[model samples]
Target: KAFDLVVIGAGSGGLEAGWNAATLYGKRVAVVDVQTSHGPPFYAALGGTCVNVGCVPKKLMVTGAQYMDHLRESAGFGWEFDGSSVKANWKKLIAAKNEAVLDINKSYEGMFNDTEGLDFFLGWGSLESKNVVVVRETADPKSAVKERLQADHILLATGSWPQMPAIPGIEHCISSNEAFYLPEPPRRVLTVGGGFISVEFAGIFNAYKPPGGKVTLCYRNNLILRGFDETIREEVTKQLTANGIEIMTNENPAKVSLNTDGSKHVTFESGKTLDVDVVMMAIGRIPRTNDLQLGNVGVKLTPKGGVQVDEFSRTNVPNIYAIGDITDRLMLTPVAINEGAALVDTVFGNKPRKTDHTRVASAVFSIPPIGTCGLIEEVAAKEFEKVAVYMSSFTPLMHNISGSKYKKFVAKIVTNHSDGTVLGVHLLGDGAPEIIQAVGVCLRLNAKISDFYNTIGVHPTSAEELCSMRTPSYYYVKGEKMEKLP
Candidate 1:
């Protein structure tokens, strides 16, 4: 079959690009993906990782975990109930999450069927040539070729996979990909790594059943979330501790072994050992181009196996392009969606558009959570000769009433020292995701710190703190923190 475009993955980026190319631009598009391609226990559905195992289900679980906090806080709001009567059911939450994901998967099917020129297929697509894609029935080498799809343009939006470490008995460990489908919440969980995935999962597991939820977060680094603002990292660590998570720093697991009782025994580099019901390794993710047969077509790939692409999402081979996680840039779902649409516009709509990769806002759904955009304080100071930092920490009004005085909301703004141009915004606590988005635009538009300070804040709100801070906490000179603003 001939198509104007043949997308190799039915993920966020591929779907968006194919949908726009077919529906809006009247191009014949074929999108192919093999369900459960990553293998059993994953059970991947349509709509890819964000919908299947990544953001959607994870966020649902995050919300479910948050109810535990609301229930705890409700006592201060005059809601009296027997705490013992309240029970957290992981099975119930997982059922609802899986059902919701199935609905989304069906909706994506509708999207494909309803569009006139778009066709979605079940197969693993690999590039046969610059203009030809071979669709195999399964990922297995012996699987028959279902069809040959010839296209003027081919896109690889295959996304990413979790990177598991190679250690003795490492196969016993699970990644975020498998965490969603655990039969039940682990009474005790040991989450490894220092990235946002590990931090977020630590918070999630910690909130499962309160006193019964024992979570140990082990990171090899001195601090977790290394790329974030230092103050944000410190604040998050404090909150994690307060929320009952054991933070283990400068430790890497030497090996993972299973005891006869079906429990995991993790031996660390320091010879420390922990026995837990689950060991989740959220270390990192790498591009999913490994199976795409890029070598056959000579597509350039990064050292990490990600497709090498230009700023416009074009690969070195003009007819073959790649976007999203497979390109190993940004790696956010929203970014992938934007890149997908932008690719269509640049390719077929006669309108050249570039999705700006800079200053895009993102959030980590840790217990307190984190929302940030632009540069971190350390990086901002290095890029500019003089940088000013504003910091504020206060207990949210809700927390005050809830009698949780230790739960503080933190807001920090990094700006140019001379002109106060907003360079970065970081927040920790409730509504951080929503607040940073508004500030994200400010950074993109090169809005001055005065834009935030000059605006009147909504009274008695955590978001208002971003606008209320009038003085610099300190200054950065020659990439070092200074005592005074000047």
Candidate 2:
């Protein structure tokens, strides 16, 4: 059937684009995806990485691990319990997480099925021309049963895949894709990489069990979270270390081998060795661009392997667009959904729009998670002539009473020294993500540092620290830190 748009990949971005185009703009749309033997059920679902393997399942595990943290932190608050009697049932957690994901997948399908002008296909789609797409039954990647659909426009949101290191005996290791489906919590776990995924999973594993589980986080760089604010990274590292996650800096895996006892023996470039029940590689994700046949219709691709798209998410071919991790702009789920809505508005609603890529807020679900919005300290210093940094660090009220060496709360705000415009905010503590979400709105509305001063805080809360800080801890002038502003 001829359609107004054929969106390939039923991901957060693709599904939103197709759904909105059909429902809001009255455009005929067809969305296509396939089932693969990835994680649970052996048959994959419609929602892409975020729903099926990445965010949803990972966050559930993060929550499961946090319960263990709570159990320990509860002891100091005079809550007595036999800690050894409590144990994490990983199989049950996986079952729960998988059930939640399946429900979401069904919800997505229901949305498309209920929409009048939208159709869903269980297959793989490849571009045949600017306005033509060929869908094939995807019993296998190269299934020959094909159906060709003609569309006025196309959107490619195939997303990305976890990039496995080409080291020896890598097959024995698992990526985030497989980590969610693990049958049991490993007694010892090694998470490799310094990215958000690495630290987050490291926290998950370290806190998986009560007292004896061991976790090591290995990274090639001295610092974790390379692109985040230095203070945010440092604090997270400190907290992770305090939580007993062995922070192996300046190390990279050279090889991984399975021992006779069904454990992993890993050798690092730093000549260090780790024997663990699990070795998870969170190195990075590469765009899922290989099978889309972008080359067939001359949709340009970036050197980074993402689809090359303009400010409005349009590829070189006028009728084609890309969004989400496939575009490599920002991989966050909300960002993808926003990009999808913006694309529909630009193309069909007669309103040309581009998503503002700057200052999007994000969080890492590590133990004592981090929430940050706007430019980082290093980035702000380079972008503005003079930057003022306000800082505060203190134990949270709960921790004070709990008497646990859990971690300290750190809050930092970066502002333009001349205009007082708040440039960035970084927080490390409980509820940091929830706090930064609102701060993200402020940053979007051009909030100034003085705005925080004018606002009063709810007392005895970790978030209040953001509002109560007054003095500039330091100033960055021409990319150099100065104790006092000139």
Candidate 3:
């Protein structure tokens, strides 16, 4: 039977689309995924990677590492621990994360099953025609019978996969997918990439290393997190360095080889070599649109392998559309859900809606965690004629009693000098992710910098620094801009 909507890939985007179409528009929806069951241990199951490997697992590891660090610095807080004697059970942490992921994934499955107009299919879906899809029952090579299905509207939301570069002996390297399920924590882990994933893993392994474990991160660029604000980027680098995470910038891995001792050795272009137990390539993710058979259906895709879509997530072929990482417009889970929901509105409800990616707030769950919303100071300076930058860099209150030199915070606001309109807001510190979400709403509604100042400060909170910056740290005039201020 042809359903009103057929969503390929039961990821965050597809799930949102299916739910919106079924619940809000009263349309019948079928969701397909390439997994036997809907949950953890199955990568492309319900709730997607964010609920599986990306957010949930990563955050669990981060929290555990933070606790491990706290235990190490307990002496400073008037608590004594056996000197250099604390231990971390990596297996226990992984087990706990797996349990949490399973529980959430099961909930997602229940939501879809119990929903009035949603159907779930367990298979890999490929486009057979403009309005038809062929499903392969099994992921393995041996077991599959093809089943054809048709839909009035089809949404592609397969998300992305880890990309491995072509280099000699590249087989020795592991992608983020494999990094999550490694048999044992590597004694000397060398992660390569400048993206948030790479930096985050570098921090995680370094912080909670198995006794004498070490970590070194190598990036091709001169600085990690190149797209972020320079001030915040520098501060994070300082903190990561102080925390003993070795960073090698402007370096590219030429080759990886297994040493005589059975460990991996990474050789860089600069003639430098790092002996590591594990080599993880956290480079980036590529869209998983190859198996969808877009060519047969005449669905347009960008040169970079991302699906081409309009503002409402409609592809070139009217009945066929795409959203989430497959679109590559904004590669965040929340953005994908927004696009998916908007697409459902346009198709089923006749309520035409478009995705507004502006002022999209995002967080990098690095060791210290970086939270940024709206535009960076550099981007804001170019957009506005006269831009004023309000910034604060200080040690957080928690650090005062702990005597830990690792904690530092940077809060910045980029505003127009002419009308005092807040152009962008960025903060990097503890609890940044929680604070940025609230501030992002204000910035989205065109809240002014003065409005932030007018708001009452949360007493003794790090977030209060956003509104409490009294003195201006040099302004950019219309014609001439001054250098850094004292």
Candidate 4:
């Protein structure tokens, strides 16, 4: 084999796989990925979605939005500045964003060079067979041939793309991929989904509202964040609304038409309409498998459009494997990284490693934000025989002095009655992501309510609430709703 491991897609998962396989396991590794697509004449850099587009830039905008919010709300924080004098320079912000993105891409290249024997290829790569990956010179269909790589083990980690619905005037729309590069913010924006991406974009846009700018979120479903805890959904909806987002539920766009002034007029299924400068589809995402040529090599895919992989990330072919969003096991970057390490260990290391997905931790970058782990309330009620729930909702400490109405925080701790093992932690508020991250570790380790109580909390911090959880606020047994019992 020309390479011991031929990994496709230089994404988080593939990067983790290639890095460890070469550095830790001492395998001869080669990675191949196409330059990510973006606005006209501008392609994305190498660090994949999280770094180049999704989390990194999205969060940067989130921070920008929050800082602008701080400027507006600074008076409440005992700081007074001429707010009008602190307006954001959108072009300057965008230039800085591009600078940071390119820097991260360079860092990835540096990592590849730091690894003694890792080969990196920039282009579309597809399977010629179970053992061969043919790299294309361009994403263009008519592009010329590139290098062909051979390996004993082939890893597929192409990740995913936002869903582009077949609506009229769809060309006028942009997905999350292109949002990062817009010259400036919009006068008005329409987000057509209630998932994290839509909520995220809407939140940032709302935070940095222009003189007459408005953000309207239209969701096909009646609620947002469909898979999260109902309380979280309720809390986030309230928070977003309080922050000035125009929300319409049970609404799906039938068609979008461009107006004479270059604004988009979107007609909904209910015959309602919205006029906005930008329309983003964050409804859902599917695996980026169209160009991978899996059929020729007999790699099967699941109904969800994920490459079919076993517990060990092994595909149908013995030496072929898939990881990350392409596998649809977990789309979060950390989950992908964890699976990547596990896949490499299973294939190239001494002991076979299996991914433990049950206790995964994830955070939503919505305005106020949310962090969740283990199970939501509905699933926990159904999955475990009996469960204990500890809950609290309060104004955060900072809000005590600032008197900010947006400081509401909600936290929940779910434990298995049978073993007292913490089963889940769902939270919505500031630092929920950071707080639940640590809770996820303990939950995975089978920490009990007592274990939480025994641990000392950082004084006056919101996370201390986890350690301070007292008697059960609710219970679920025999499929009943919240009842008292811990």
lDDT of all the models against the reference?
0.87, 0.86, 0.82, 0.83
lDDT of 2 by residue, 420-475 (tens): 99999999888888899999899999998788988998987888888887789999
Off by over 4 Å in 4: 36-44, 139-143
How far residue 237's Cα lies from its native spot in candidate 3, in Å, is: 0.8
In the predicted model 1, the residue pairs found to clash are: none
Candidate 1 per-residue lDDT over residues 232-324, each given as its tens digit: 798889889987899999999999999999999999999999999999998888998867888878999987778998888988888898989
Displacement of residue 168 (Cα, Å) in model 2 is 0.8
Q: If scored against the real structure, what TM-score would every candidate get?
A: 0.97, 0.97, 0.95, 0.96
Q: What digit string (tens of lDDT, one per residue) describes model 4 on residues 1-486?
A: 399999888888998999999999888998986764323342434666788777887888887777755665567778976666765566777787788777788888888888877988878888888888888886653566687888899999888888889988888999888777777788799988998999999988786666778999999988999888888898899888887898899999999999999999999989998899999888888898888888878899999889998889988898899988998767888888888999888778867888888978899988688998888767888988788888888878676666567657988888887787888888888788888887777877888989988899899888888898868888888668756543
**Separate clash counts for every candidate:** 0, 0, 0, 0
The alpha-carbon deviation from the true structure for residue 400 of candidate 2, after best TM-score superposition, in angstroms, is 2.0
In model 2, pairs of residues that clash are none
Off by over 4 Å in 2: 36-44, 139-142, 209-211
The residue pairs that clash in candidate 4, if any, are none
Q: In model 2, which range of ten residues has the least summed lDDT?
A: 36-45
Q: What is the lDDT of candidate 4?
A: 0.83
Question: Sorted on TM-score, highest at the top, how do the candidates line up?
Answer: 1, 2, 4, 3
Across 239-294, the per-residue lDDT of candidate 3 in tens digits comes to: 88888888899998999999999899888999998899989998889898887878
The candidate that achieves the highest lDDT relative to the unseen native structure: 1
